Design an enzyme around this catalytic site. Structure first.
Site, mmCIF file in Angstrom:
data_model
loop_
_atom_site.group_PDB
_atom_site.id
_atom_site.type_symbol
_atom_site.label_atom_id
_atom_site.label_comp_id
_atom_site.label_asym_id
_atom_site.label_seq_id
_atom_site.Cartn_x
_atom_site.Cartn_y
_atom_site.Cartn_z
ATOM 1 N NE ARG B 180 41.227 41.052 38.728
ATOM 2 C CZ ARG B 180 41.891 41.717 37.795
ATOM 3 N NH1 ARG B 180 41.254 42.357 36.825
ATOM 4 N NH2 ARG B 180 43.203 41.761 37.843
HETATM 5 C C1 LIG Z 1 37.793 36.378 38.998
HETATM 6 C C2 LIG Z 1 39.256 36.622 38.981
HETATM 7 N N1 LIG Z 1 39.966 36.130 39.993
HETATM 8 C C3 LIG Z 1 41.317 36.322 40.000
HETATM 9 C C4 LIG Z 1 41.974 36.958 38.979
HETATM 10 C C5 LIG Z 1 43.485 37.025 38.996
HETATM 11 O O1 LIG Z 1 44.076 38.338 39.020
HETATM 12 P P1 LIG Z 1 44.274 39.236 40.317
HETATM 13 O O2 LIG Z 1 44.901 38.366 41.402
HETATM 14 O O3 LIG Z 1 42.892 39.802 40.678
HETATM 15 O O4 LIG Z 1 45.132 40.378 39.777
HETATM 16 C C6 LIG Z 1 41.241 37.485 37.901
HETATM 17 C C7 LIG Z 1 41.942 38.148 36.825
HETATM 18 C C8 LIG Z 1 41.581 38.964 35.816
HETATM 19 S S1 LIG Z 1 40.007 39.351 35.105
HETATM 20 C C9 LIG Z 1 40.777 40.366 33.913
HETATM 21 S S2 LIG Z 1 39.966 41.190 32.761
HETATM 22 N N2 LIG Z 1 42.128 40.388 34.045
HETATM 23 C C10 LIG Z 1 42.650 39.605 35.036
HETATM 24 O O5 LIG Z 1 43.865 39.506 35.252
HETATM 25 C C11 LIG Z 1 39.855 37.281 37.905
HETATM 26 O O6 LIG Z 1 39.097 37.742 36.932
#
Ligand code: A1H16
Ligand code: FMN
Ligand code: FMN
Ligand code: A1H16
Ligand code: NA
Ligand code: NA
Lengths: 209, 209
Positions: B180
């Site tokens: 991320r």
């Molecule tokens: C900056 C940021 N913080 C949090 C999360 C939440 O998902 P996780 O807790 O990392 O799985 C995401 C999630 C993403 S980006 C993408 S393409 N697909 C996702 O599910 C994020 O981009």
């Protein structure tokens, strides 16, 4: 092909969401069925929108996680109202959800944060989300440094990182049709001859496309 | 895989949009590369969002067509500010656009309306978009009746049907990454050490993910 009031799975729109969501998850041409667009705005009416992932849903609403100091998080804290869009192109379906937002308890945010991969935890400590930064090397360097710092230790959840839940006030189920004469069945919390009782305090009505 | 300031196609974010849009159009796993989420809100800060199709773009902005009497059209007329989201999942890319909105001239709306298939023209005369209607049969019956009325004639564009153009004030280019730690390059109209000159009155900055 018709989407009709007499073939709703449920008159509780959260359960109708669950039925459509399951169909999307079962569809091999859909990648992230829980991707959604989150729309926020300032109190003074300046809107913003971005993709997010849904992280849970049920009667109390639709959950997501983000940095509270981000652009969206400052809008949500000052103006606690949002709208969601789910769009499943291979099913020709859209779901819209409107409602107020509140923060999830800190304990729930800690549990969720420590369930994430450790590399994603460190990424959240690196990133002051939506702040101006000099270059991508700034992220790579600080990430590598925090990897060293947290070798064989727990990564603390940033104080500014956590979750929100959107409690649904309006839920629209949209099914595309030929000629742009789409099917729209819209649930709202609340009787005119075109207004129908759903479960609990829900009402529903068809809207012109 | 890196999205970097030194490999931008253009420092005019409309031309950078054109470069990414062309890649999306060339991608066989993308259906409608011009699908977008339009976010609007009331003056008093109640947001709403829905899918729309982009119908043209260039220096004066991003064009779309809708019923001015719809829910979005009443918000845009009272509060002429909006935001757009383009999401191309197979390219791991998002584009956000923020700006004021005005109506397209009536003559442009007539030309666009009469370029649509005749069945879609009649559908727009049938539908008082976002008004409550009794059932789907109401649409089918009125559609069939207007088909009879307009046999071998031109369908007049409804007075309430037309177009808007969003003049870009902010354009974010987002590219997803592992952990991320996404790449975000954001153009805004306007110098700090992290702010860079683009074309015309554009500036750009990297934002933390
Ligand atoms: C900056 C940021 N913080 C949090 C999360 C939440 O998902 P996780 O807790 O990392 O799985 C995401 C999630 C993403 S980006 C993408 S393409 N697909 C996702 O599910 C994020 O981009
Ligand atoms: C499919 C997808 C899912 C995303 N999920 C999240 C997420 O759950 N939380 C988050 O903070 N950002 C997520 N993002 C990144 C956001 O779109 C956005 O860049 C970020 O939240 C900052 O938005 P803001 O500047 O409006 O606050 C996701 C992006 C994509 C494309
Ligand atoms: C991919 C896609 C494209 C759409 N394009 C348009 C469009 O260009 N114009 C429009 O009025 N509605 C369009 N719609 C329908 C809208 O999502 C929405 O149902 C309608 O505009 C009413 O929104 P409102 O009640 O917020 O005014 C589209 C829907 C989908 C799924
Ligand atoms: C109600 C309504 N009015 C207007 C338009 C604009 O497109 P067009 O002028 O009919 O091609 C659309 C567009 C749609 S719906 C869908 S799925 N894909 C689209 O491009 C619409 O749904
Ligand atoms: Na309630
Ligand atoms: Na300008």
């Amino acid at each position: 092909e018709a989407f009709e009031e007499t073939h709703l799975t449920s008159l509780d729109p959260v359960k109708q969401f669950a039925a459509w969501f399951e169909e999307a998850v079962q569809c091999p041409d859909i990648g992230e069925a829980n991707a959604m667009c989150l729309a926020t705005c300032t109190r003074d009416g300046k809107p913003s929108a971005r993709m997010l992932l849904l992280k849970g849903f049920g009667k109390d609403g639709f959950r997501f996680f983000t940095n509270f100091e981000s652009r969206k998080g400052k809008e949500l804290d000052s103006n606690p109202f949002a709208s969601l869009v789910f769009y499943w192109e291979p099913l020709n379906r859209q779901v819209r959800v409107e409602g107020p937002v509140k923060k999830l308890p800190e304990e729930e945010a800690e549990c969720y944060f420590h369930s994430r991969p450790k590399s994603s935890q460190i990424g959240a400590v690196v990133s002051h989300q939506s702040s101006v930064i000099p270059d991508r090397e700034y992220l790579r360097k600080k990430n590598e440094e925090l990897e060293q710092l947290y070798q064989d230790q727990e990564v603390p959840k940033p104080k500014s990182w956590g979750g929100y839940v959107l409690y649904p006030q309006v839920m629209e189920f949209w099914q595309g049709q030929t000629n742009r004469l789409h099917d729209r069945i819209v649930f709202r919390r609340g009787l005119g001859p075109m207004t129908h009782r759903g479960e609990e305090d829900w009402l529903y009505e068809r809207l012109a496309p």
